[PDB]
Each structure stands twice: as structure tokens, then as C-alpha cells.
Design an enzyme around this catalytic site. Structure first.
Site, mmCIF file in Angstrom:
data_model
loop_
_atom_site.group_PDB
_atom_site.id
_atom_site.type_symbol
_atom_site.label_atom_id
_atom_site.label_comp_id
_atom_site.label_asym_id
_atom_site.label_seq_id
_atom_site.Cartn_x
_atom_site.Cartn_y
_atom_site.Cartn_z
ATOM 1 N N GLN A 144 1.008 -1.128 -0.080
ATOM 2 C CA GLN A 144 -0.031 -0.002 -0.052
ATOM 3 C C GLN A 144 0.855 1.452 0.112
ATOM 4 O OE1 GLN A 144 -1.179 2.439 2.570
ATOM 5 N NE2 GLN A 144 -2.400 3.457 1.047
ATOM 6 N N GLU A 184 -4.283 -5.866 -0.410
ATOM 7 C CA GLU A 184 -5.750 -4.837 -0.112
ATOM 8 C C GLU A 184 -6.047 -4.101 -1.354
ATOM 9 O OE1 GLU A 184 -4.733 -2.845 3.496
ATOM 10 O OE2 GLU A 184 -3.311 -1.783 2.831
ATOM 11 N N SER A 244 6.953 -0.721 1.072
ATOM 12 C CA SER A 244 6.889 -0.235 2.643
ATOM 13 C C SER A 244 6.682 -1.634 3.386
ATOM 14 C CB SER A 244 5.838 0.604 2.759
ATOM 15 O OG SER A 244 4.452 0.061 2.880
ATOM 16 N N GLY A 287 2.195 -6.432 6.006
ATOM 17 C CA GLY A 287 2.501 -7.870 5.685
ATOM 18 C C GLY A 287 2.826 -8.100 4.075
ATOM 19 N N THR A 288 2.064 -7.440 3.252
ATOM 20 C CA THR A 288 2.130 -7.393 1.914
ATOM 21 C C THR A 288 3.752 -6.808 1.528
ATOM 22 O OG1 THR A 288 1.228 -6.953 -0.422
ATOM 23 C CG2 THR A 288 0.765 -5.308 1.411
ATOM 24 N N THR A 343 2.824 2.837 12.064
ATOM 25 C CA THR A 343 1.373 2.623 11.864
ATOM 26 C C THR A 343 0.833 1.314 12.195
ATOM 27 O OG1 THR A 343 1.902 1.679 9.746
ATOM 28 C CG2 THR A 343 1.455 4.248 9.913
ATOM 29 N N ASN A 367 10.267 7.892 7.542
ATOM 30 C CA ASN A 367 9.297 8.916 7.682
ATOM 31 C C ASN A 367 9.680 10.249 8.406
ATOM 32 O OD1 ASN A 367 7.530 7.037 5.938
ATOM 33 N ND2 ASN A 367 6.703 6.121 8.088
ATOM 34 N N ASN A 405 4.376 11.477 -1.242
ATOM 35 C CA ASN A 405 4.385 10.643 -2.456
ATOM 36 C C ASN A 405 4.863 11.412 -3.731
ATOM 37 O OD1 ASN A 405 3.864 8.649 -0.767
ATOM 38 N ND2 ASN A 405 2.103 8.280 -1.573
ATOM 39 N N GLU A 464 27.103 2.626 -14.053
ATOM 40 C CA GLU A 464 28.338 3.386 -13.177
ATOM 41 C C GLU A 464 27.804 3.644 -11.869
ATOM 42 O OE1 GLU A 464 28.891 6.614 -15.991
ATOM 43 O OE2 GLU A 464 30.887 5.964 -16.316
HETATM 44 N N1 LIG Z 1 5.992 6.879 1.848
HETATM 45 C C1 LIG Z 1 4.705 6.433 1.906
HETATM 46 N N2 LIG Z 1 4.644 5.313 2.826
HETATM 47 C C2 LIG Z 1 3.468 4.667 2.616
HETATM 48 C C3 LIG Z 1 2.395 5.109 1.906
HETATM 49 N N3 LIG Z 1 1.394 4.276 2.139
HETATM 50 C C4 LIG Z 1 1.669 3.624 3.620
HETATM 51 N N4 LIG Z 1 2.942 3.541 3.548
HETATM 52 C C5 LIG Z 1 3.591 2.850 4.568
HETATM 53 O O1 LIG Z 1 3.378 1.435 4.583
HETATM 54 C C6 LIG Z 1 3.458 0.832 5.761
HETATM 55 C C7 LIG Z 1 2.706 -0.505 5.750
HETATM 56 O O2 LIG Z 1 3.015 -0.953 4.476
HETATM 57 P P1 LIG Z 1 2.023 -2.007 3.641
HETATM 58 O O3 LIG Z 1 2.747 -2.932 3.246
HETATM 59 O O4 LIG Z 1 1.781 -1.222 2.597
HETATM 60 O O5 LIG Z 1 0.817 -2.215 4.746
HETATM 61 P P2 LIG Z 1 -0.440 -3.177 4.211
HETATM 62 O O6 LIG Z 1 -0.464 -2.746 2.720
HETATM 63 O O7 LIG Z 1 -1.748 -2.816 4.876
HETATM 64 O O8 LIG Z 1 0.246 -4.600 4.168
HETATM 65 P P3 LIG Z 1 -0.718 -5.731 4.967
HETATM 66 O O9 LIG Z 1 -0.663 -5.595 6.496
HETATM 67 O O10 LIG Z 1 -0.503 -7.160 4.530
HETATM 68 O O11 LIG Z 1 -2.308 -5.341 4.807
HETATM 69 C C8 LIG Z 1 2.893 2.166 6.691
HETATM 70 O O12 LIG Z 1 3.554 1.939 8.047
HETATM 71 C C9 LIG Z 1 3.198 3.396 6.035
HETATM 72 O O13 LIG Z 1 4.183 3.933 6.683
HETATM 73 C C10 LIG Z 1 2.545 6.303 0.939
HETATM 74 O O14 LIG Z 1 1.664 6.644 0.294
HETATM 75 N N5 LIG Z 1 3.753 6.890 1.113
HETATM 76 MG MG LIG Z 2 -2.070 -4.473 2.725
#
Ligand SMILES: Nc1nc2c(ncn2[C@@H]2O[C@H](COP(=O)(O)OP(=O)(O)OP(=O)(O)O)[C@@H](O)[C@H]2O)c(=O)[nH]1
Ligand SMILES: [Mg+2]
Ligand SMILES: Nc1nc2c(ncn2[C@@H]2O[C@H](COP(=O)(O)OP(=O)(O)OP(=O)(O)O)[C@@H](O)[C@H]2O)c(=O)[nH]1
Ligand SMILES: Nc1nc2c(ncn2[C@@H]2O[C@H](COP(=O)(O)OP(=O)(O)O)[C@@H](O)[C@H]2O)c(=O)[nH]1
Ligand SMILES: [Mg+2]
EC number: 3.6.5.-
Lengths: 420, 429, 69, 50, 429
Positions: free
Chosen positions: E11, E61, E130, E134-135, E169, E196, E218, E244
Site C-alpha cells: 500500500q 488489499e 513499504s 504484511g504485503t 502505523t 518517515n 509521494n 556506473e
Molecule cells: N512513503 C509512503 N509510505 C506509505 C504510503 N502508504 C503506506 N505507507 C507505509 O506503508 C506501511 C505499511 O506497509 P504496507 O505493506 O503497505 O501495509 P499493508 O498494505 O496494509 O500490508 P498488509 O498488512 O499485509 O495488509 C505504513 O506503515 C506506512 O508507513 C505512502 O503513500 N507513502
Molecule cells: Mg495491505
């Protein structure tokens, strides 16, 4: 074309035929007056469509009552084969003394209606097995028409003695006497019983004040849906003989259970969706049959399905594939692809879909055995016999009828489990 | 010069032919009126300067027949090419080949008799018989028999639709199919097989429509057949010969059951977003998911392959695609055929039908291949046939119609002879 | 009396049948996937994978032409 | 009464299903195990020396 | 020639990629229509003369996924590059790498398979995961594994977003991050880290906006990435090579975790009042307050540094700024690298997005550095991991998903091996 002739028998068969003609008139846009506002009807000068429907019976009160109700002008005044004495719940009465003198009036009228057509693909009988008239008279008509016309296909929408109670005290005698003369000369016996019909109009339909016209309407909607694939177009059409082939692999196990759909509550008719997966759920549901034999206590030698309405064929394919996938051993596996499927291209009056399931399975053998059991009970202990024996019948024929029923069921059961 | 005749016998073949002609008119520019606001192969002369097709729609059950004779396409067909029966064949072979076949066979023979007299340069026949039903099995078998005993010299390309692998619209399919295969061997000089599962997968996950129906299926088959007959209809760069088809795709008269494929099958919604290069299409060409029938490409070792290019196709992309497919190991050919590739270029793009899911694209290719995989369909039909024959089922329906019992077995090991040869021809040395 | 005991026994029989069907169909589908994956294994394992890049005929070309040069 | 037939059938099918589960495990392990062109450019290498 | 592929898995990565492409179109002149009223690296050919990006947005998701597929940027992406799951990975590594990963991995591999077949001259990958979720942890790890076992030879630049130093988060961040670091070592050939806190400080007290949000973040990352890819997109004075980048910023394959920086980040309200000289920007370049990640410039001894100059830049101000930064004591380099500076001049100024806080200026510079400070982020992640692992927390969430317990520890001392090497390589002799 591919004609039908609608001979009736007994008060049961008479009422069912009346309501079936009511349904087919209300479907083809035919009034009770007989106009349009030929596969079933005949042309008559003045712009009329007469149903080639013969009503034979040993009593006229039934005749008068079916004339009195609506849609009575359909039947023309010759096909009312009038009996004056009544067999009085006696197979001997309805089959020998009054048979052998009504046969030929019925012969003249059936030759009438048969020459009226060009190609008479199949017959149509609705009668009883328990009433003296219905049973004896009807199986005798079957024997006679199968004597002269060996190339047609015979078909009986037959009501059997009820499980919880016998409608007439000699239901077992008359029923075994009807099946003993049914097996060899009747090609498709759609088995129906008043009690299971009660169950299907009671359970899922809210009907708390039922009536015989209501059960007649139900079974006549089913009776119209079994063949509605004939007179109408369709992407994949069938007939009485593709059905007969795909249904019977042996000339003996040719007795069929039938069901028709959809049928749900009316107050709940809005909350539910209405789809073809739901149609499959509806009738592969055990309770939706019209016979007192849950088919999942046995096995499906084979089964045919006939759709009504225009949806895809991906449907019927995934349909019989899915149903075979889980209720496999609920069928028989010694025969490949034991489910046949066809499509009629027109939906019912006012609704979206219709489905008719017919089944050549081995669960009516217990119906046959319960009939034979009641028979043998009243039979050794000699219950209710002089009514049959003082009218030119002997119990040698009763013994052979009982044993023949037993022979039929012995094949049914061993073909249930025959595998290789 | 080149004229081709099409029988559409049965209920499957007749609807396939309905779609065939409904597509042929819109492609050649013919409106359903019979009026047109080349076509030599399909369309004849009526002395008033308009066209009536050289084809016959034959079927025992008259339902689809009055459907076509009171539908919207009445103005095309000749009333002499639509004969109806009043009964069926009950899905069994004997009622369509022995009892009810004989009074329709001579009428159909007289109609095609006069029709082959009508056209001058006949070049081939196309029998359209879905064998699952009694008519498309027995009457089609008898039609092919009579065609081969009268004409003989002329090629016959049968688009027979077998009983599907596990799905079935009838239970007695295994009997009346093995029995038609006997006549299908000798008579159908080349037999391009059809089954249902693969076109179902194609229509579902290739055009993204979620319910595939028979009208769409027959339209799609008609599009494939348009890609097939474009070479003779319209002028091309390197025109191919339909008698070259036989001499190049029939290495032995024992191996002539052939399968097909088409590209591209894509919606407009992905056609606008895809490049669809000439080299790119040649990959989905031999894609096993793209396969049109129940055959596995790696099951069969390709013995002959004909590619049908239509549209804006330059020959060297074709020649380099042949090189890349012959290089990569995922494909293989029989050793005895070191070069089993024949290509045909055509400058006519695929025409479009209003109301079709199909998308207009620059390049289209159609594959037609003689391989050894079809034996699996053969053995799979034999599965159901033996499972039904081992237990006496529906035997009466066949013997009570002028048929002996031994024909079941003779047809079973007849198709077993095909299965044997199809693996004896494709081995090493 | 015994008829209702038979009724309850047959409800147990119905449950048992229904179960046997569930597990039989699970077994079928599992086996079909397993056969799919096993045939994928047998075709993915190449017959020249041990020599991931060998091409011995051209290795011979290599050596003989090296001697030549 | 007559239930032991279907009970032994259930035991048979359950042993067989878990047995094909073992099968699947074995096959995924072998897939992970197997998870672990130059001829023309060498002809090009020859062209220069000749 | 040079094409670069970007996965936006998770995400975080998917929104970073949304902003990346929303900025790429406005920079190259592409409108969100897919219509444009060079772009070689990012934009392909569709045969109708318009562009579809070479990137895939992957996430368990599906929320942000339907956000992008029914938002305003639908006309850009191909429907083949957006696949959705119906569940998540529950923020634990095992549900994204072991259970739900396996049925998405082959689909993503087939899509990038055909996409690397689509473009001709692939030069590198960019994984956007990120790891906090989990993903972005497990599925991104498995994606990088498969990318490296299929492609291998090609460079991979991962913009992975670690669990933040103290903000979070999610609570189970420490587990599913240490476990991804294992695959992050081998597969992500060079890994430009993200956190962050530093971009929060930048957006708050650098652009003077008082609430920084993820869309702005972003967008800002997309601007940094535009400064990164300008060298290959548009022509420059002394063009640099992305291979390089590796040979100059990877002194040892053990030290390839690198950080970044950008100048100038200034509002228009101070851009109108500042001079912003070429020499002046090079000071805020290595400013520790300007730092983009949680690294301390005086914590690490610089081992390699690449400077990305874009706009109206003359080389001698660059060369003199290098001299002044190498003179003053506040910076230092590793002794083994006597010269660890590589610069790249580009004549393309930064393009402007309508509705952005960012200001248009003449000169922009982007720093990307391989140093030894990142080990502090490593040990700080190890803090939370050990504090959670010492007490059994969320262990069931991981082991009930096909995961063994020892992988926690093996990943812990795996990242500890990085911490060890990162201080063993940067010492005196
Ligand atoms: N820089 C930046 N970080 C983001 C953004 N959206 C989410 N994150 C980071 O992504 C982290 C979570 O990573 P993800 O793998 O995307 O979380 P998820 O998609 O809910 O993964 P699942 O738990 O498996 O459902 C959060 O702690 C955020 O700090 C974004 O738009 N920009
Ligand atoms: Mg997710
Ligand atoms: N591809 C395709 N197949 C069709 C179509 N219509 C019917 N079929 C196939 O035809 C099979 C039956 O073949 P037919 O010989 O036409 O059946 P029939 O006409 O009822 O033959 P009888 O049983 O003698 O009455 C079915 O199983 C279908 O799969 C069609 O429009 N397209
Ligand atoms: N479905 C239906 N069955 C009926 C009806 N009337 C009577 N029956 C059944 O028909 C049987 C009577 O048989 P029948 O031949 O008509 O009696 P008979 O005329 O005196 O010989 C009884 O067992 C009833 O259950 C009816 O209106 N509908
Ligand atoms: Mg037919």
C-alpha cells in the site's frame, strides 16, 4: 407438429386433464372460449381451436363437474366417453366387464383423433392406479393402443397409493394390477403421489388452504414444462425420443420421477434473487420432488433437464458438471455423463425462468415394494377378494402381478449398484 | 473457378451455418436481403444479378429450420436447400443412419446433385455435423458416405463436433459418435475436429464476456472460417491452395484428423492498449491456452502446420517468427518431417460484424495442424463408450432400429486403430 | 418405538453419507491438482538440465577449431 | 445397522487424501530443489580468426 | 535503449507509484488521458501512437487499487498490470510470503515476464515496498526473490520504507521487517532506504505547510525520482550511467544500502527572496537538516557519493563546490576511498506540477550516498525486534501461517551481519 392425444381416466385424471388444458390455453393465449387472444389444438371452422382431448370414465358426475368448471368449452361433445355404472373401486369392474364393452367406443374415438393428425409422435394418459375405473380402464386403454400402434411412445402421469393412508381400501390390489399391466406397454410412467404433492404445495409456498384444483394447477404446470421444449424454438431442442433414449438404458427401468421449478414463497418472493444456480439449488434439493421417495436414498440411473427462458449454455454445462461433481455417488457412475440437458427458448407466463427435471432412478422401487407389501398382506389373509373374484378374475393373476412387481424391483435394485 | 459446398447437417451444424452465412454476407458486402448495394466461391448467379448461397441446411428436427425460414435471413437461402423431417433420431445412431436417413438421403443427394451441376468449378466439401445427436451422427455419416461414393475425387473437410470431454448435452453420446467415426475415417478426407471446452474458455477469459452462448460460439467459428476461406475469396500476396492443404497436411492418409487455432481474440478494451505485433501474435498462435480444441500442443509432435496470415502482413516477420518458434524448445516437430511448416499470406484484413464482441485489428493468423495429440480425444471418447458398452445401456435403442450389436465394437476398435497409428507414425527412428 | 430409533439412526446415516461425499470430492480435486503439478514437474525438469549449458557437439567444434586457429 | 462399510470407506479415503498431501509436499520440495546461447557468439568468435 | 521497470507492491509502494506516474506524465507532457498533445525509458508503444507505462501496481488489499482504477488516472495503466487480492497479510510476514504470496507470485511473474519481453533494452528494476505491512514485507520479498532468480544480471534499486524510528502505523512492524531484510540483502542489489521522520521534518519546516500528508510525501518522492531518472530520460552535458552507479557506489557487495537527499526544497515565498546559487545549493546538499532519511551525516564516513545536477548547471561551480566540501572538516570520507565523488550534469530543469507546494528554480541537485550510518537504522529496527521477540509476542500470528520460529532470529543476526560489516569496512588501516 409432432402430435399429442390427451386421453383421460378416473376422476383424478379427469381433473388433472381439465387443469392441464386450462394451463395450456392460458399459455398459448386461448380463452375458455377456444380462440387465440396445432401441436396441441385442432382447427375448426369459425376460427376455433378444439383440444383433441378424450375424457373417458365409468361415471358421469366427474364428466359433469369437469364440464361445469371454467375452460369447459375446450373439449368437444364427442370425446366425453360416458360410463353409467362406475367400477366402484374394483379393478375387475373397471377392466373386464366394463372394459370389454367400452374399449371400442374409445377405439373409434382414438382412431378419430389419430387420423386427425399426420404424425402422432406420442400419446398422453393421466389416470390412477387405485380407483377401479381409472386403474383398470386406463391400463386397458394402454394395452389396446400399444397393441395397434407399436411405433408410438406411451406415457402415463400416474398417481399411486398414498403412503400414510390408502385412499380406497383396495389401493394395493388395484395398484399392483395396474403396474403388472403397466410395465411392458407403458413407455414413460411419471410417478406422482397426492401426499408428496401436498408436501410441495405446503412447505415452501405458504399455502394454508389448499384445493384439488390447486394441486391440479401445480402438476399441470409441471406437465406443460416437461414438453414445452417441443412446440417452441430453442438453441438445443429435444423430443419424446431423445428424452426416452437419454432416460432409459433398459426397456424396464423406464419409470420416472418429475419436478418443475421455480416455486417459492410469495411474501418472500422479493427478498430472494432469481438465478439459474438458484434453480439448481431448488430442484436438486431433495424436497422438491413430486413422489414419496427421496431420490438421495437411492441412485440416479440417469437424469434429464429441460430449461425454459433465454440464457446461456455455459449455464447448463457448469450446471450438470457441478451437480455431478458433488452428488456423484448420489447418481450411478457406471454410465458416463448421466445428465442430459436441453433448452426451450421461452420463459413462463409472467416470470423469468422455468426448469423441468425428470429422473430415471432407482428410488421408486421402494414405492413398488410398499405397494406389493400392502398387497401381499391383504392378499394371503384374503382381504377384499370376492369383489375381484366374482367378476371373472382369479388370484393366479394377482400372484403373477405381485411377483412381476417384485421382479421389476429386483432389477431396479441390482442396477442401482451394478458397477464394472 | 473455385467453389466450395457446405452441408450443415444436424442442429449444431445448422446453427454453425446460420452464423457462417450471416457473417459471409456482411463480409462480402451482401445484406440479408440477398441484395448487395471476390464472392465467386460462395455466391451464385440468379439471372437477376443477385446471390443465393451454395449450401444446404439439413436436420431431422425442424425447429431451427423454421427458425431460419421465418427469421430475418430468409432472403438469402433457396427454398430448395431447406428440407425438414417430422421426427428426430432420438440421439441414437441407428435412427439417423438406418431408419429415418434413407428417405432424406436421396432428396439431399438430388439437391446437391443439381447444385454441383449449378456451380462449375467445385473444389471441396465442408460437412458440419455435431455428432452428439442422432441426426448429426447417423444422417451425417450417411451423407458423407454418399458424397464419397458419388464424388470421391474431391476433398472433404469435416468440422465435426464430438461429444465434449466430460460435459454432455446427451448421455448416449458415446455410442452414436464412435459409430460415425467409422464413416468419418474414409469419407472425411481431412477432419478438423471441434469440442466445446476450449471455445468456452476462450469466450469466457479471452473476450471477457462472462456468459458465452451458442450464437457467439457460432459467430466465432464463422470468423475462423472466414480467415480460412479469405485466401480463395480475395486476392493475397502468396496465395495458398486448398489441395496443397491436403498434400502438405496429410503426410499419410491415416493421419488427417487436424486441429486449429486463431489469433488475435481480444476485446477492443485490450486492443486499444495492446501493440499486437506480427511477431507477438505468432506466440499466442501456438499458446496452449489459445488452443481451440481439447488437444495439448506438447502432447502431439507437430507433423504438419499451415498458418493463415490475413491483413497487413509482410513476409519477413512471418519468416522470423517461424525461426523463433523452431528455435525455442517448447515446440517440437516429428523427426521425419524436418520442415512441417506452410504459410499463406493474404492482404485482406478480417471484416467486422455489427454486434460482435470481436475486435478489429491489423493482423490475423489462423493455425491448422496435423499432429498426434487428437488420439487423446479419441481415447477419451472410447472411455465413455466402453463404460456404457460394458453395461448394456441404451443397446435396445440402437438394435430396435435396424442395427446389429457388433457395430458398436467394430467402431470402437476402428477408432482404436486411429489411436494406434497416431502414435506409431510419430516416433523416432 | 423402534421405528423412531431407526429414524435417528438414519439421520446419522444421512450425515455420514453426506460427509463421505464431501471428503471424496476433496480427495478427487486434490489428486487432480497433484497430478497437474507432478506433470508440470516432469516436463520442467529438462533432459539436458544437468548440463545446464553443455551443447557437446559445439564444444567439439570449439576445441577442433581452437586447434585449427 | 449397516454403517461400518461407510466408516471404513471414510478411513480409507482420509488415509488416501493425507497420503496425497504427503505426495504434494514431496513434489513442492522437488520443485524448490530444481529452483536452484553462447554457441552462436562463439561462432562469431571464430569468424574473426578465420 | 534504456528501459526501467517499477513494481509498486504494498500500500505504500502503490501510492508512491501513483504519484510517480502522475508526475511522470506531467513532466514528459503526457496528459492523464494516455494522450500526449525523451520518454523512451518509461513509455511504450501501443500501435496507435500513445503510451502505457511499464510498471505494475501490486497489493493484497484492493482498496487503493480500485482507487486508481476508478480515479482520474485510469487511462494510463494497462488492465493487465493491476491484479488484486481479496485479503491481506495481517501485517505479518508469513501471510504475505508463505500463504497468500504463492498464487499472486506467478501471475506477477507472467505479467513482468511478458513486459520484459515487451520492452527491448531493460536496464534496471525499482521495487517499491513499504515493509511495515504484511504485503510490502513478504510479497515484496518473494517478488524480489523471483526477480533475482529469473533475471539476476540486472540491477535492482529498492526504495523500501522501513518501520519508522519510533512512530509506527503497526505494532508487529519489527518482525515482518527483519524477515524481509534477508531477501533485501541478496536481491535488492542496491537499496536506497526510506523512513518517515525526515520527510516529515522537511515537509513541515522546509515547505512551510503545517500538515504534511501522504499525497504530498509521494509527490515529493516522485520529484526526487524525476531528478534521478532525468539523466536517462533527457539529454545532458555529461551523462551518467546507472550501471556506473553500482560500480561507483558499491565498493563491496556487502555495503550497498544507500541514502539520499534533494535540493532545493523551498517555497516560492522564499524562492523569490533567495539567490540559490550553484555553490549555495551544494551546502544545503549535505546539510544534516536536509537529510532525507534517519541517518546522521557525521555518523557515517562517506564511502561513495553521487550528485545529480539538473537545470542550468556549469561544471566549474560543481568542481569548486566539491573542493570546498572536501576542504572543510565537517565532512569526511573513508580513507580507503581517497576520491569518493561522482557527479552528473543534466541540462533539463525540474518540471513543475500544478497544485504542488514545490517551487520552480534554475538548479536542482540530488545526492545518493553509500555510507556507514545506515547501521543505526539497522540497530534501531533490531531494538524493537528483540524487545518483541524476547516476549513471545505475535509469534502465533507468524507460525500459524507456514513459518518456523527460527527465521525471526536468523533474520535478526542477518541484519546484525550488515551492522558488523558496515563498521568493519569503514575504519582506518
Ligand atoms: N512513503 C509512503 N509510505 C506509505 C504510503 N502508504 C503506506 N505507507 C507505509 O506503508 C506501511 C505499511 O506497509 P504496507 O505493506 O503497505 O501495509 P499493508 O498494505 O496494509 O500490508 P498488509 O498488512 O499485509 O495488509 C505504513 O506503515 C506506512 O508507513 C505512502 O503513500 N507513502
Ligand atoms: Mg495491505
Ligand atoms: N458449436 C455448436 N455446437 C452445437 C450447436 N448446436 C448444437 N450443438 C451441438 O450438437 C450436439 C447434438 O448434436 P445434434 O445432432 O445437432 O443433436 P440433434 O439435432 O438433437 O440430433 P437428434 O438427437 O437426432 O435429434 C449438442 O451436444 C451440441 O453440443 C451450435 O450452435 N454450435
Ligand atoms: N391429483 C389428484 N388426484 C385425485 C383427484 N381426485 C381423486 N384423486 C385420486 O385418484 C384416486 C381415485 O381413482 P379413480 O380411478 O379416479 O376412482 P374411480 O373413478 O372410482 O375408479 C384416489 O386415490 C385419489 O387419491 C384430483 O382431483 N387430483
Ligand atoms: Mg436433432
Amino acid at each position: 407438429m409432432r402430435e399429442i392425444v390427451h386421453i383421460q381416466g378416473g376422476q383424478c385424471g379427469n381433473q388433472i386433464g381439465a387443469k392441464f388444458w386450462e394451463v395450456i390455453s392460458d399459455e398459448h393465449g386461448i380463452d375458455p372460449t377456444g380462440t387465440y387472444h396445432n401441436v396441441y389444438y385442432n382447427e375448426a371452422t369459425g376460427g376455433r381451436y378444439v383440444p383433441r382431448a378424450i375424457l373417458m370414465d365409468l361415471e358421469p358426475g366427474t364428466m359433469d363437474s369437469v364440464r361445469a368448471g371454467p375452460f369447459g368449452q375446450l373439449f368437444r361433445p364427442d370425446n366425453f366417453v360416458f360410463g353409467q355404472t362406475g367400477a366402484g373401486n374394483n379393478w375387475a369392474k373397471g377392466h373386464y366387464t366394463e372394459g370389454a364393452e367400452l374399449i371400442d367406443s374409445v377405439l373409434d374415438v382414438v382412431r378419430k383423433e389419430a387420423e386427425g393428425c399426420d404424425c402422432l409422435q406420442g400419446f398422453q394418459i393421466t389416470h390412477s392406479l387405485g380407483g377401479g375405473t381409472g386403474s383398470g380402464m386406463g391400463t386397458l386403454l394402454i394395452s389396446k393402443v400399444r397393441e395397434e400402434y407399436p411405433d408410438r411412445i406411451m406415457e402415463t402421469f400416474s398417481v399411486v397409493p398414498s403412503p400414510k393412508v390408502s385412499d380406497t381400501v383396495v389401493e394395493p390390489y388395484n395398484a399392483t394390477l395396474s403396474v403388472h399391466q403397466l410395465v411392458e406397454n407403458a413407455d414413460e410412467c411419471m410417478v406422482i403421489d397426492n401426499e408428496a404433492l401436498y408436501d410441495i404445495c405446503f412447505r415452501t409456498l405458504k399455502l394454508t388452504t389448499p384445493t384439488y384444483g390447486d394441486l391440479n394447477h401445480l402438476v399441470s404446470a409441471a406437465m406443460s414444462g416437461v414438453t414445452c421444449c417441443l412446440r417452441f424454438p430453442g438453441q438445443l431442442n429435444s423430443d419424446l425420443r431423445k428424452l426416452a433414449v437419454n432416460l432409459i438404458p433398459f426397456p424396464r427401468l423406464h419409470f420416472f420421477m418429475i419436478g418443475f421449478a421455480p416455486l417459492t414463497s410469495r411474501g418472500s418472493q422479493q427478498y430472494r434473487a432469481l438465478t439459474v444456480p438458484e434453480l439448481t439449488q431448488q430442484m436438486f434439493d431433495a424436497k422438491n420432488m413430486m413422489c414419496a421417495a427421496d431420490p438421495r436414498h437411492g441412485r440416479y440411473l440417469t437424469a434429464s433437464a429441460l430449461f425454459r427462458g433465454r440464457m446461456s449454455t455455459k449455464e447448463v454445462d457448469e450446471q450438470m458438471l457441478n451437480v455431478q461433481n458433488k452428488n456423484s455417488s448420489y447418481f450411478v457412475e457406471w454410465i458416463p455423463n448421466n445428465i442430459k440437458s436441453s433448452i426451450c427458448d421461452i420463459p413462463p407466463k409472467g416470470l423469468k425462468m422455468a426448469v423441468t427435471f425428470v429422473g430415471n432412478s432407482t428410488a421408486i422401487q421402494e414405492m413398488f415394494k410398499r405397494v406389493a407389501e400392502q398387497f401381499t398382506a391383504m392378499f394371503r389373509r384374503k382381504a377384499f377378494l370376492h369383489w375381484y373374484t366374482g367378476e371373472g378374475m382369479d388370484e393366479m393373476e394377482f400372484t403373477e402381478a405381485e411377483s412381476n412387481m417384485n421382479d421389476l424391483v429386483s432389477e431396479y435394485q441390482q442396477y442401482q449398484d451394478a458397477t464394472a | 473457378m473455385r467453389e466450395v459446398i457446405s452441408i450443415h447437417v444436424g442442429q449444431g451444424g445448422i446453427q454453425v451455418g446460420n452464423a457462417c452465412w450471416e457473417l459471409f454476407c456482411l463480409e462480402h458486402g451482401i445484406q440479408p436481403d440477398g441484395q448487395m448495394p471476390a464472392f465467386n466461391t460462395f455466391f451464385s448467379e440468379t439471372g437477376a444479378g443477385k446471390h443465393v448461397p451454395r449450401a444446404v441446411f439439413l436436420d431431422l428436427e425442424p425447429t431451427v429450420i423454421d427458425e431460419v425460414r421465418t427469421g430475418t435471413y430468409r432472403q438469402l437461402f433457396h427454398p430448395e436447400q431447406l428440407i425438414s423431417g417430422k421426427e428426430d433420431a432420438a440421439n441414437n445412431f441407428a435412427r439417423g443412419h438406418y431408419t429415418i436417413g434413407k428417405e432424406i438421403v436421396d432428396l439431399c443427394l438430388d439437391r446437391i446433385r443439381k447444385l454441383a451441376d449449378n456451380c462449375t468449378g467445385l473444389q471441396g466439401f465442408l460437412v458440419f455435423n455435431s455428432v452428439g445427436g442422432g441426426t448429426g451422427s447417423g444422417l451425417g455419416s450417411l451423407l458423407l458416405e454418399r458424397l464419397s461414393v458419388d464424388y470421391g475425387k474431391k476433398s472433404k473437410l469435416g468440422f465435426t463436433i464430438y461429444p465434449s470431454p466430460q460435459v454432455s448435452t446427451a448421455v448416449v453420446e458415446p455410442y452414436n459418435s464412435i459409430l460415425s467415426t467409422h464413416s468419418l475415417l474414409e469419407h472425411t478426407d481431412v477432419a478438423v475436429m471441434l469440442d466445446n471446452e476450449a471455445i468456452y474458455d476462450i469466450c469466457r477469459r479471452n473476450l471477457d464476456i462472462e456468459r458465452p452462448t451458442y450464437t457467439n460460439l457460432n459467430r466465432l467459428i464463422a470468423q475462423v472460417i472466414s480467415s480460412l476461406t479469405a485466401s480463395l475469396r480475395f486476392d493475397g500476396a502468396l496465395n495458398v491452395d486448398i489441395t496443397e492443404f491436403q498434400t502438405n497436411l496429410v503426410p499419410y492418409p491415416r493421419i488427417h484428423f487436424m486441429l486449429s487455432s486463431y489469433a488475435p481474440i481480444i476485446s477492443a478494451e485490450k486492443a486499444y492498449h495492446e501493440q499486437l505485433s506480427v511477431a507477438e501474435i505468432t506466440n499466442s498462435a501456438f499458446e496452449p491456452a489459445n488452443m481451440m480444441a481439447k488437444c495439448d500442443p506438447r502432447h502431439g509432435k507437430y507433423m504438419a502446420c499451415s498458418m493463415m496470415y490475413r491483413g497487413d502482413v509482410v513476409p519477413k516477420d512471418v519468416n522470423a517468427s517461424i525461426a523463433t518458434i523452431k528455435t525455442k524448445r517448447t515446440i517440437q516437430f516429428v523427426d521425419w518431417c524436418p520442415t512441417g511448416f506452410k504459410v499463406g499470406i493474404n492482404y485482406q484484413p478480417p471484416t467486422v460484424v455489427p454486434g460482435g464482441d470481436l475486435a478489429k485489428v491489423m493482423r490475423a493468423v489462423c493455425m491448422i495442424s496435423n499432429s498426434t495429440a487428437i488420439a487423446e480425444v479419441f481415447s477419451r471418447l472410447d472411455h465413455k463408450f466402453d463404460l456404457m458398452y460394458a453395461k448394456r445401456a441404451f443397446v435396445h435403442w440402437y438394435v430396435g432400429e435396424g442395427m446389429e450389436e457388433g457395430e458398436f465394437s467394430e467402431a470402437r476398435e476402428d477408432l482404436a486403430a486411429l489411436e494406434k497409428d497416431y502414435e506409431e507414425v510419430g516416433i523416432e527412428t | 418405538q423402534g421405528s423412531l430409533v431407526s429414524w435417528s439412526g438414519d439421520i446419522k446415516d444421512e450425515n455420514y453419507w453426506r460427509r463421505k461425499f464431501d471428503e471424496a470430492r476433496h480427495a478427487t480435486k486434490n489428486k487432480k491438482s497433484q497430478l497437474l503439478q507432478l506433470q508440470d514437474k516432469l516436463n520442467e525438469v529438462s533432459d539436458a538440465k544437468f548440463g545446464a549449458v553443455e551443447e557437446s557437439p559445439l564444444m567439439r567444434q570449439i576445441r577442433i577449431l581452437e586447434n585449427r586457429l | 445397522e449397516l454403517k461400518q462399510k461407510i466408516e471404513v470407506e471414510r478411513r480409507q479415503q482420509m488415509e488416501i487424501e493425507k497420503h496425497v498431501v504427503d505426495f504434494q509436499k514431496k513434489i513442492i520440495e522437488k520443485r524448490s530443489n530444481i529452483g536452484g546461447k553462447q554457441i552462436k557468439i562463439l561462432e562469431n568468435r571464430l569468424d574473426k580468426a578465420n
